[PDB]
Amino acid sequence: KILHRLLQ
Amino acid sequence: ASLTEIEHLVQSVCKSYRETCQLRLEDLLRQRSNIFSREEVTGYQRKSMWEMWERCAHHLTEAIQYVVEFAKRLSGFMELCQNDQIVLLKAGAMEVVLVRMCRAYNADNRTVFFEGKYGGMELFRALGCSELISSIFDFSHSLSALHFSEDEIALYTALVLINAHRPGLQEKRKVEQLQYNLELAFHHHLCKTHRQSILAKLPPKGKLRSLCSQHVERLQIFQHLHPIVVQAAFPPLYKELFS
Numbered sequence A: 001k002i003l004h005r006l007l008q
Numbered sequence B: 001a002s003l004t005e006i007e008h009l010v011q012s013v014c015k016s017y018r019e020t021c022q023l024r025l026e027d028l029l030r031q032r033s034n035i036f037s038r039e040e041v042t043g044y045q046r047k048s049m050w051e052m053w054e055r056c057a058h059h060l061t062e063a064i065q066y067v068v069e070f071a072k073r074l075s076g077f078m079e080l081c082q083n084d085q086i087v088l089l090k091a092g093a094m095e096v097v098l099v100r101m102c103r104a105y106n107a108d109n110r111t112v113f114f115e116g117k118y119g120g121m122e123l124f125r126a127l128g129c130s131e132l133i134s135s136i137f138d139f140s141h142s143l144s145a146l147h148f149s150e151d152e153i154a155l156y157t158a159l160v161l162i163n164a165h166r167p168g169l170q171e172k173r174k175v176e177q178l179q180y181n182l183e184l185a186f187h188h189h190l191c192k193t194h195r196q197s198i199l200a201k202l203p204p205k206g207k208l209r210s211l212c213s214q215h216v217e218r219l220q221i222f223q224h225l226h227p228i229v230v231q232a233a234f235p236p237l238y239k240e241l242f243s
């Protein structure tokens, strides 16, 4: 969830 | 597939690294006389296990956030599918921080930069994971003996991240192609600068894997002792990568 947010 | 193209990759990678290196090397070097006193050291040792774990997890998370940004700016990374980006970061982010950490390590007195000053491994005694701590220190000591330039760290850490063997990759061949070009860039730069002697002295991948496994193992032991502390007070990114 957090890693997804940082990448997008 | 041409010297000019490879050389362009070398500079791109080095730039991406400079922009995301967290702390400038000079800043870290300037602070080497700023060392925790006996009283501050004793102060760290008197802290609870769980407070110390929380603080270390916070600082690790900050460092990882810079590595995530490094990856986003790393040529070819964002063109991989999201599954593979996450796989590479989950497996490699910690390994990159561990390599980057030698920059903040002082081989002359065996200290590392932590919360504004330099301290030895005794600073971390409250964690209750002495084997993990001394392994990270030893790893940092071994990397310090190579005298990495910043550009070398940039190129080497790019390769630590872009690893086509990571389980779970959907576009394996595409990661292989990027890995190969970064290897060429790293090795071309080493050849140009007469530094190919370091190739045989780089740590094996199993060493980096061993450090990451130990870290996860010691976290698991700690989380069993203080589950609400991890749930309530550990950074979410940390738990996502390591729980």
Ligand SMILES: CCS(=O)(=O)c1ccc(CC(=O)Nc2nc(-c3cc(Cl)ccc3Cl)c(-c3ccccc3)s2)cc1
Binding pocket: B021, B022, B023, B024, B056, B057, B059, B060, B063, B097, B100, B101, B102, B103, B104, B105, B112, B113, B114, B115, B124, B133, B136, B137, B140
């Ligand atoms: C990395 C990029 S930088 O060079 O710009 C930079 C930027 C900031 C800092 C300050 C810092 O965060 N120090 C820390 N020291 C350790 C540490 C280091 C050793 Cl050698 C042994 C034991 C520990 Cl705990 C940390 C740690 C925490 C949790 C798990 C594993 C490791 S965090 C240092 C370096």
